[PDB]
Structure formats: structure tokens, C-alpha cells
């Protein structure tokens, strides 16, 4: 199954957040540490993406574009998985040195969102998702948000996407092998409104970040200020399986 080989091979490892657990759980520290993590996990997302099958066939601006649009969802999906596998979904396994219990969920002022992410995590258990399914689904997520008028080379993108769908089809490869497809497509859809809420939250946060002493690393601030607003303003949209 050459495609799995790749996905299993290139899957990024553990990434620590750099969080000082000796300090108390302030809003500023939890959030500056999550911003750091984000910047760290983006390095790995980039390296991973470049090594995906067919990915470097996309025009290079498209390449950068889809990474910058889809990092949240990708990162949230992978964090849901880690939480499922390491803490059976009581808490949120952001990094081994940044595990959110409920207190941290409240202190982050993103309790609401963290509730939605914990559901996502539970669903990994609820649905008995295999590692191979996770991987194929996670890759699809890279190809699940685009400009509404399209990318420079949109035809190559649609083809690639098609192909990642068939792979998820294949790893599922006729009443379960169909109702299953319904379920995972459903689960993938569910990532989008959660990422939507985090985009809104982080963008709001970056705007008021001098007022609250929250540090945003360089590329995170660029992406939040240039790219995220295209999603928030409706210029860039998720692609859903189901309407």
C-alpha cells in the first residue's frame, strides 16, 4: 500500500511546547506557550506537507497558500488524536509539557473551544478510528480549504484532492464500507467549525496582544494577520463533504 508507507514514514513525531510548568497558569503564559507550539508545529507541518505524495506538483504559491489556510485544522485534528491515545480524552494533549486540564481550559479563556476539541478527541474513540484512517484523514485536511475564486493551478489541486479521497476510500476498502465513509467524512467536516472558532479567537487575540501580554512568534503573527483574515472575511472557505 505505497501511499500508507509514505504517510506512516513522514508522520511528524513529538513536539514539546517549551512551557514552564513551574510558573502559574496565567492567561498570558498558557497562550504565549500555545503560540510558541503553533510556530514549532508549523515547521513540522511544512516539512511533512512537502514530502506528501503529489504535493510538489501543485504550483508553489498554491503550496504555501493551502498550508497557511489549513494549519489550524490539521494541528487541531492531530492534537485530538494525541489526546485520544495518551489521556483517553479527559484532557487536551497539546504537547507533553502542555496538557490542558479543565483549569487550564478555563484560564486560557477558550473553555468553549476546548470543549469542542475534547468532543473531537472522544469521537476518535467513539468511532474506533484506526491509525491508518487518522493519517489518511489528516492528509485530506491539507486539501480542505481554498480561495473561493480558486488557486493559481486549481485543476492540479482538485485532482490531488480526488486522489486523497480515493486513498481514504481504499484504506476503508459495502454497508459498513459505506456507512463508515459517511462517518469519517462527517468527522472531517466537524473540524472546520472548530478551526473557524480558533481563527476568530487567535485573530482577536493578536489584535489585543499588547493589552494582555501575549507573545506571538514572527510567522504566526504574519499568518494570523494576512491569511486568517481571508478565511474570516469569506474569501477563503472550507470544502465540506456534506452541506
Amino acid at each position: 500500500p505505497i501511499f500508507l508507507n509514505v504517510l506512516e514514514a513522514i508522520e511528524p513525531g513529538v513536539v514539546c511546547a517549551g512551557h514552564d510548568n513551574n510558573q502559574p497558569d496565567s492567561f498570558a503564559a498558557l497562550l504565549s506557550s500555545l503560540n510558541e507550539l503553533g510556530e514549532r508545529q508549523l515547521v513540522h507541518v511544512v516539512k511533512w506537507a512537502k514530502a506528501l505524495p503529489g504535493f510538489r506538483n501543485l504550483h508553489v504559491d498554491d503550496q504555501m497558500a493551502v498550508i497557511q489556510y489549513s494549519w489550524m485544522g490539521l494541528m487541531v485534528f492531530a492534537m485530538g488524536w494525541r489526546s485520544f491515545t495518551n489521556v483517553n480524552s479527559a484532557m487536551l494533549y497539546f504537547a507533553p509539557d502542555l496538557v490542558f486540564n479543565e483549569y487550564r481550559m478555563h484560564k486560557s479563556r477558550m473553555y468553549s473551544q476546548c470543549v469542542r476539541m475534547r468532543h473531537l478527541s472522544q469521537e476518535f474513540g467513539w468511532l474506533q478510528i484506526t491509525p491508518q484512517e487518522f493519517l489518511c484523514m489528516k492528509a485530506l485536511l491539507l486539501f480542505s480549504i481554498i480561495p473561493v475564486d480558486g488557486l493559481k493551478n486549481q485543476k492540479f489541486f482538485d485532482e490531488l484532492r480526488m486522489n486523497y479521497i480515493k486513498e481514504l476510500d481504499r484504506i476503508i476498502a459495502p454497508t459498513s464500507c459505506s456507512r463508515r465513509f459517511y462517518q469519517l467524512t462527517k468527522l472531517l467536516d466537524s473540524v472546520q467549525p472548530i478551526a473557524r472558532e480558533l481563527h476568530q479567537f487567535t485573530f482577536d487575540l493578536l489584535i489585543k496582544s499588547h493589552m494582555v501580554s501575549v507573545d506571538f512568534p514572527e510567522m504566526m503573527a504574519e499568518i494570523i494577520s494576512v491569511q486568517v483574515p481571508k478565511i474570516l472575511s469569506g474569501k477563503v472557505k472550507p470544502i465540506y463533504f456534506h452541506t
Binding site: V46, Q63, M64, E218, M219, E222, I223, V226
Partner: peptide, 8 residues
């Protein structure tokens, strides 16, 4: 952009 230059 800083991303445009890291990625290339």
C-alpha cells in the same frame, strides 16, 4: 513575506 522566504 517571512513565510515566503522560509518555505523557499
Amino acid at each position: 513575506s517571512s513565510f515566503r522566504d522560509w518555505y523557499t
